[PDB]
Design a protein around this ligand. Structure first.
Ligand SMILES: *[C@@H]1O[C@H](CO)[C@@H](O[C@@H]2O[C@H](CO)[C@@H](O[C@@H]3O[C@H](CO[C@H]4O[C@H](CO[C@H]5O[C@H](CO)[C@@H](O)[C@H](O)[C@@H]5O[C@H]5O[C@H](CO)[C@@H](O)[C@H](O)[C@@H]5O)[C@@H](O)[C@H](O[C@H]5O[C@H](CO)[C@@H](O)[C@H](O)[C@@H]5O)[C@@H]4O)[C@@H](O)[C@H](O[C@H]4O[C@H](CO)[C@@H](O)[C@H](O)[C@@H]4O[C@H]4O[C@H](CO)[C@@H](O)[C@H](O)[C@@H]4O)[C@@H]3O)[C@H](O)[C@H]2NC(C)=O)[C@H](O)[C@H]1NC(C)=O
Ligand SMILES: *[C@@H]1O[C@H](CO)[C@@H](O[C@@H]2O[C@H](CO)[C@@H](O[C@@H]3O[C@H](CO[C@H]4O[C@H](CO)[C@@H](O)[C@H](O)[C@@H]4O)[C@@H](O)[C@H](O[C@H]4O[C@H](CO)[C@@H](O)[C@H](O)[C@@H]4O)[C@@H]3O)[C@H](O)[C@H]2NC(C)=O)[C@H](O)[C@H]1NC(C)=O
Ligand SMILES: *[C@@H]1O[C@H](CO)[C@@H](O[C@@H]2O[C@H](CO)[C@@H](O[C@@H]3O[C@H](CO[C@H]4O[C@H](CO)[C@@H](O)[C@H](O)[C@@H]4O)[C@@H](O)[C@H](O[C@H]4O[C@H](CO)[C@@H](O)[C@H](O)[C@@H]4O)[C@@H]3O)[C@H](O)[C@H]2NC(C)=O)[C@H](O)[C@H]1NC(C)=O
Ligand SMILES: *[C@@H]1O[C@H](CO)[C@@H](O[C@@H]2O[C@H](CO)[C@@H](O)[C@H](O)[C@H]2NC(C)=O)[C@H](O)[C@H]1NC(C)=O
Ligand SMILES: *[C@@H]1O[C@H](CO)[C@@H](O[C@@H]2O[C@H](CO)[C@@H](O)[C@H](O)[C@H]2NC(C)=O)[C@H](O)[C@H]1NC(C)=O
Ligand SMILES: *[C@@H]1O[C@H](CO)[C@@H](O[C@@H]2O[C@H](CO)[C@@H](O)[C@H](O)[C@H]2NC(C)=O)[C@H](O)[C@H]1NC(C)=O
Ligand SMILES: *[C@@H]1O[C@H](CO)[C@@H](O[C@@H]2O[C@H](CO)[C@@H](O)[C@H](O)[C@H]2NC(C)=O)[C@H](O)[C@H]1NC(C)=O
Ligand SMILES: *[C@@H]1O[C@H](CO)[C@@H](O[C@@H]2O[C@H](CO)[C@@H](O)[C@H](O)[C@H]2NC(C)=O)[C@H](O)[C@H]1NC(C)=O
Ligand SMILES: *[C@@H]1O[C@H](CO)[C@@H](O[C@@H]2O[C@H](CO)[C@@H](O)[C@H](O)[C@H]2NC(C)=O)[C@H](O)[C@H]1NC(C)=O
Ligand SMILES: *[C@@H]1O[C@H](CO)[C@@H](O[C@@H]2O[C@H](CO)[C@@H](O)[C@H](O)[C@H]2NC(C)=O)[C@H](O)[C@H]1NC(C)=O
Ligand SMILES: *[C@@H]1O[C@H](CO)[C@@H](O[C@@H]2O[C@H](CO)[C@@H](O)[C@H](O)[C@H]2NC(C)=O)[C@H](O)[C@H]1NC(C)=O
Ligand SMILES: *[C@@H]1O[C@H](CO)[C@@H](O)[C@H](O)[C@H]1NC(C)=O
Ligand SMILES: *[C@@H]1O[C@H](CO)[C@@H](O)[C@H](O)[C@H]1NC(C)=O
Ligand SMILES: *[C@@H]1O[C@H](CO)[C@@H](O)[C@H](O)[C@H]1NC(C)=O
Ligand SMILES: *[C@@H]1O[C@H](CO)[C@@H](O)[C@H](O)[C@H]1NC(C)=O
Ligand SMILES: *[C@@H]1O[C@H](CO)[C@@H](O)[C@H](O)[C@H]1NC(C)=O
Ligand SMILES: *[C@@H]1O[C@H](CO)[C@@H](O)[C@H](O)[C@H]1NC(C)=O
Ligand SMILES: *[C@@H]1O[C@H](CO)[C@@H](O)[C@H](O)[C@H]1NC(C)=O
Ligand SMILES: *[C@@H]1O[C@H](CO)[C@@H](O)[C@H](O)[C@H]1NC(C)=O
Ligand SMILES: *[C@@H]1O[C@H](CO)[C@@H](O)[C@H](O)[C@H]1NC(C)=O
Ligand SMILES: *[C@@H]1O[C@H](CO)[C@@H](O)[C@H](O)[C@H]1NC(C)=O
Ligand SMILES: *[C@@H]1O[C@H](CO)[C@@H](O)[C@H](O)[C@H]1NC(C)=O
Ligand SMILES: *[C@@H]1O[C@H](CO)[C@@H](O)[C@H](O)[C@H]1NC(C)=O
Ligand SMILES: *[C@@H]1O[C@H](CO)[C@@H](O)[C@H](O)[C@H]1NC(C)=O
Lengths: 452, 132, 132, 45
């Protein structure tokens, strides 16, 4: 006869939902928005075991990790902005006019605005002048006012804190584990036959972008295309590149940062003046690295859309937040006119040898600066980006693309940041939190002994 | 091929192996159990969560009499309805994950039986000690 | 000098005495273990910290087989490399604080041996009960 | 004023200068308030 026995510590796991906490290496008063100093040190060399003879299903579209940390970022942003100046007094009449200085001809992007600003003492008021971009001021029936005056009081980022994208690790408590896939040709959903268990994830850099994923991890084998329903054109498409293309963006100008007092204990920094000539910001991209990159992705899309011509066109239009490629550079918010990048099409039949295209050729872009930003695609918050003295330059690598599809023949793909959450889905696609069940019961021939 | 003693294996190791083989790696899993700012609240919520999960298993073990024993036999017999496969094909032809999936429906009935059986093992033992 | 039964001694008492003498005062230390505003958060952080520390010791004890036993013998032998002093000079010529400082380097090796030994004590016992 | 109705001494048509979206400018606005929430002065409320 057989008897029941109880086993403790068996290798059994069950999918579950649980909270996570950060973990990052020590860095060093220095202030950071992500508060990485408060995060737990991770390890020199964390423990990772590669499981064998195991197949586990994955589904990144129903992953709570992306939903969880999405709410973390907004709370972190809200946490650090409470002890900062509020720019309500700045809602005053602006007497703006063309800036005068001795391309330069196209100077209709910044205006020399003058206004009455309250000094340290409330009753007295004095005249002050500052430079504002065209995108942050609107006219009246010949004066101007800030765009956010009729929407909500808009706060300021304290210059002490820096919000660079420091990589962080989301780690689960004891009794839970995170499963990592290793198949190089793994799409969003499906079984994984090389799953490996790890205590928690690798360094993930929180980057805010709309059309292009920057300075991220690269695909190993080949280009990866992920989408919940490819046949449905209403869902965004995430593209992960196995070869990255560098991007150089800059705002070449030495703009003096001037401190202006607007009340007792309140002082905000603005743009003082221009020393030199007026020159627009721009971004430079090599022609071959983009033509070849769009060539490789074009043939990859052919398998999913056989015998269909594929063309890449610019965005439709409308709101500027998603039409243009918005990103960050040293704390300055850019908005680049991405129209020349998607000015080509892939032909499934033809010759595409790269030597035809000349080398040392770059794709210059037109980008504009907007120092008043409303985030998370919701009109419930704002933040005034202060300027920086001197000229800035940020170099990064393009990692992924966020494209959208829209009757017969040619297939049109357009760039669009439909949702912000897709930025991190490209990083957490190979992670899944799971719960451990160390209890096991099976029959056996052993019987408990009873003392008489 | 050199041999591993099974004490050097990592967490969740031998999950895809046979049930009999995985029975020799129970120790490694037990070790990992219980390993003002925004982060503090989430970290604090994590610490209590780990304690609650560990204590749930130990509470069941104590009632069943396996308070500290890693492998413990019992007196309740196995029912063929819960599982019909033979011993040879159970310990040498499938993994632990499949086994728990198969009998997950009958888990509630078995848990009650262990509590009832072990509780009966205590009252009758007490009656034996009263004859001195 | 009137005698104290060693149950009336306070916490951390007999710390400066010999190891053998201090072995008779294990009970008193065990008792003290697990004894919206700004204070509430710090107090709450204190309560979870006490639970975590107490449970860590109990988790190790359960694997070693001393789930509830205050003093438990084991089957693993002692290695002369870890300590070379004789029994007479250990229990009657130094305190517990010095002893732990001396062998603090070899604590990791001893801990693993207890889990491996006790785990082996379970599988072979199970084989014996299967002969009925 | 509108064209029981006779006992209309419970809601009063109060007018005041309300700041617009811009701080410096002020414009006249009117609203109805109950008599229990406003007190007179030595003929303003
Ligand atoms: C199933 O999937 C398995 C997993 O993918 C797979 O096993 C893997 O196989 C590949 C191919 O054989 C192995 O690739 C090699 O990796 C070496 C480096 O390995 C070390 O680093 C790894 C990564 O570590 C980071 O990421 C971890 C993620 O969990 C973290 O835990 C780490 O802490 C670390 O994080 C840090 O870095 C991150 C970015 O790297 C960053 O984001 C993060 O924030 C943080 O900063 C570790 O996983 C790995 O650990 C394993 O191994 C060590 C022992 O080495 C153990 O202690 C661990 O427990 C664990 O088991 C290591 O620490 C590469 O150096 C190596 O490159 C060389 O080889 C390739 C191909 O051969 C060449 O292309 C390359 O150029 C190199 O060769 C060149 O140089 C040599 C001279 O050195 C020269 O002679 C040669 O000619 C050439 O010029 C190679 O890429 C991989 O290590 C395997 N394991 C893992 C875990 O990935 C398995 O094959 C699959 N198939 C099955 C199961 O059938
Ligand atoms: C994608 O990822 C890439 C790769 O990192 C990013 O590119 C880097 O971005 C960071 C952050 O913007 C840049 O860091 C900045 O570097 C400036 C220049 O540093 C050089 O020169 C100084 C002297 O001028 C040297 O001392 C230094 O060692 C370097 O040689 C710094 O001036 C900046 O300082 C900032 O931080 C300090 C910290 O204390 C503050 O005190 C300052 O006030 C200021 O805020 C800053 O550190 C870096 O240069 C970029 N390049 C590289 C190769 O790392 C992309 O920006 C990123 N893109 C996105 C969208 O995330
Ligand atoms: C890699 O780089 C190569 C070149 O560097 C790119 O190839 C270029 O692609 C563009 C876009 O297709 C080519 O521009 C033109 O495309 C037209 C598409 O046809 C439609 O649009 C025209 C617009 O008037 C309509 O009239 C027409 O009915 C269609 O609706 C072609 O029709 C054009 O052809 C004309 O010019 C060529 C010049 O090569 C002549 O030979 C033709 O006879 C005709 O007069 C034109 O081709 C551009 O020409 C391509 N350059 C080449 C082949 O050197 C790749 O797109 C890029 N890779 C990726 C992935 O984008
Ligand atoms: C922006 O306008 C202000 C006036 O509102 C300019 O300030 C004057 O500049 C002239 C010439 O530089 C000086 O002679 C005056 O003394 C300045 N007066 C004050 C009160 O500042 C300012 O120069 C203008 N800046 C730009 C870039 O056009
Ligand atoms: C800022 O304050 C000055 C005075 O401190 C204002 O100047 C007056 O503006 C009014 C506008 O209705 C004129 O009628 C007066 O004649 C001005 N007085 C003087 C002495 O110039 C000025 O209007 C305020 N606003 C701005 C934008 O400067
Ligand atoms: C898809 O694109 C290819 C070229 O990229 C088109 O091929 C040409 O089609 C026209 C007719 O529309 C022919 O006159 C040309 O001779 C074709 N090119 C060559 C090189 O032969 C093709 O028509 C497009 N449409 C489809 C459905 O494939
Ligand atoms: C070569 O070009 C041909 C174009 O005729 C591609 O195949 C054809 O694609 C059209 C698309 O409208 C289909 O209607 C035809 O049925 C296709 N031909 C056949 C025989 O099926 C073909 O894909 C191109 N070659 C490559 C390698 O892409
Ligand atoms: C492959 O690349 C070569 C590299 O130049 C291309 O050859 C050029 O073709 C153009 C147009 O026919 C000529 O004006 C150049 O003089 C050629 N240069 C050389 C070095 O041969 C060639 O056309 C490409 N193959 C294609 C496009 O099919
Ligand atoms: C891309 O086009 C430029 C056009 O300026 C080419 O520049 C030429 O480079 C050669 C070799 O360095 C010089 O002898 C010529 O005088 C340059 N042309 C000028 C100054 O007009 C460049 O060579 C092209 N790319 C490649 C790979 O040949
Ligand atoms: C409350 O008082 C306001 C004035 O302070 C009245 O508003 C005026 O109403 C008359 C008649 O309805 C209109 O001809 C005017 O054009 C209105 N002027 C403004 C500025 O609103 C309002 O009608 C009064 N409401 C009540 C219920 O008595
Ligand atoms: C609201 O503002 C208006 C003007 O914008 C005020 O009208 C003045 O009120 C003072 C009261 O001391 C009179 O002396 C002036 O003659 C008025 N001017 C005009 C043009 O009418 C008004 O008093 C303010 N308060 C209210 C309740 O309306
Ligand atoms: C506003 O600027 C113009 C610039 O010519 C000037 O003429 C005008 O007087 C300014 N406004 C005021 C109220 O001074
Ligand atoms: C600023 O320059 C543009 C350039 O044409 C001109 O149309 C405009 O009238 C100028 N504005 C002022 C206030 O002079
Ligand atoms: C991962 O899975 C794909 C198919 O889903 C397979 O082609 C690939 O070989 C797998 N990776 C391995 C075995 O490393
Ligand atoms: C992803 O891969 C799986 C298995 O390779 C396949 O069944 C599925 O159609 C692919 N696409 C999506 C959107 O899941
Ligand atoms: C990237 O993938 C494409 C897919 O066609 C392949 O042609 C290319 O060689 C790959 N490059 C690298 C560096 O893996
Ligand atoms: C995608 O959406 C279309 C819409 O009709 C549907 O027919 C198709 O089955 C969907 N495919 C999926 C969810 O894989
Ligand atoms: C901008 O002006 C400052 C101050 O005059 C100067 O130090 C700096 O060199 C200027 N920028 C450039 C690029 O020369
Ligand atoms: C970017 O390209 C433009 C094209 O003319 C050039 O003027 C500028 O100097 C370049 N900027 C760089 C390489 O930083
Ligand atoms: C982007 O630039 C193109 C031309 O370079 C222009 O036609 C288009 O309207 C621009 N879009 C935006 C949003 O600036
Ligand atoms: C990616 O970016 C880093 C820093 O910006 C740079 O060092 C590295 O070379 C880039 N990758 C490639 C392939 O150029
Ligand atoms: C197994 O369970 C069934 C259902 O209650 C019961 O009739 C049967 O007696 C049980 N088997 C044994 C051996 O007790
Ligand atoms: C003590 O440890 C050493 C080092 O591994 C070992 O060689 C020796 O056999 C051990 N002693 C005993 C009695 O096992
Ligand atoms: C260890 O003890 C023995 C006797 O107990 C002694 O002879 C030996 O010298 C000691 N070893 C060391 C290293 O002192």
């Amino acid at each position: 006869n057989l008897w029941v026995t109880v086993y403790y510590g068996v290798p059994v796991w069950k999918e579950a939902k649980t909270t996570l906490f950060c973990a990052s290496d020590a860095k060093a008063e220095v202030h950071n928005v992500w508060a990485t100093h408060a995060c737990v040190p991770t390890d020199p060399n964390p423990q990772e075991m590669v499981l064998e003879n195991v197949t586990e299903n994955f589904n990144m579209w129903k992953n709570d990790m992306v939903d969880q940390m999405h709410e973390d970022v907004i709370s972190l942003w809200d946490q650090s902005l409470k002890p900062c100046v509020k720019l309500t007094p700045l809602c005053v009449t602006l007497n703006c006019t063309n800036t005068t200085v001795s391309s330069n001809a196209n100077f209709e992007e910044m205006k020399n605005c003058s206004f009455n600003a309250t000094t340290e003492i409330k009753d007295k008021k004095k005249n002050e002048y500052a430079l504002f971009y065209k995108l942050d001021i609107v006219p009246l029936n010949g004066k101007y006012r800030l765009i956010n005056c009729n929407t909500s009081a808009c706060t300021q980022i304290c210059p002490k804190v820096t919000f660079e994208p420091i990589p962080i690790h989301y780690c689960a408590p004891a009794g839970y584990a995170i499963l990592k896939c290793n198949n190089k040709t793994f799409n969003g959903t499906g079984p994984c036959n090389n799953v490996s268990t790890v205590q928690c994830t690798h360094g993930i850099k929180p980057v805010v972008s709309t059309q292009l994923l920057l300075n991220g991890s690269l695909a190993e084998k080949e280009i990866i295309i992920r989408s919940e329903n490819l046949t449905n054109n209403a869902k965004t498409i995430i593209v992960h590149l196995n070869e990255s293309v560098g991007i150089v963006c800059t705002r070449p100008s030495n703009m003096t940062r001037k401190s202006i007092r607007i009340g007792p204990g309140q002082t905000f920094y603005a743009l003082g003046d221009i020393i030199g000539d007026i020159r627009q910001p721009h971004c430079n991209i090599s022609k071959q690295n983009w033509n070849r990159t769009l060539q490789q992705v074009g043939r990859k899309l052919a398998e999913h859309f056989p015998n269909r011509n594929i063309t890449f066109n610019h965005s439709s239009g409308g709101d500027l937040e998603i039409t243009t490629h918005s990103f960050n550079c040293r704390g300055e918010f850019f908005y680049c006119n991405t129209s020349g990048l998607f000015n080509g099409t892939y032909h499934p039949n033809g010759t595409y040898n790269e030597t035809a295209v000349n080398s040392s050729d770059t794709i210059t872009l037109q980008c504009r600066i907007k120092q008043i930003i409303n985030m998370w695609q919701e009109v419930g918050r704002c933040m005034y980006a202060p300027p920086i003295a001197g000229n800035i330059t940020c170099n990064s690598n393009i990692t992924g693309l966020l494209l959208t599809r829209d009757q017969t023949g040619e297939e049109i793909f357009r760039p669009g940041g439909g949702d912000m959450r897709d930025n991190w889905r490209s990083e957490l696609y190979k992670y899944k939190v799971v719960e451990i069940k160390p209890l096991g019961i099976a029959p056996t021939k052993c019987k408990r002994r009873v003392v008489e | 091929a050199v041999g591993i003693g099974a004490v050097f294996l990592g967490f969740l190791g031998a999950a895809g192996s046979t049930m009999g083989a995985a029975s020799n790696t129970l120790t490694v899993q037990a070790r990992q159990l219980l390993s003002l700012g925004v982060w503090g609240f989430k970290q604090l919520q994590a610490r209590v969560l780990a304690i609650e999960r560990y204590l749930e298993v130990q509470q069941l073990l104590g009632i069943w009499g396996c308070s500290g024993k890693l492998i413990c036999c019992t007196n309740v017999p196995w029912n063929s309805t819960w599982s019909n496969r033979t011993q040879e094909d159970i310990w040498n032809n499938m993994t632990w994950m499949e086994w728990e999936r198969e009998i997950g429906n009958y888990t509630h009935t078995i848990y009650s039986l262990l509590e009832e059986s072990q509780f009966q093992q205590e009252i009758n033992e007490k009656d034996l000690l009263a004859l001195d």
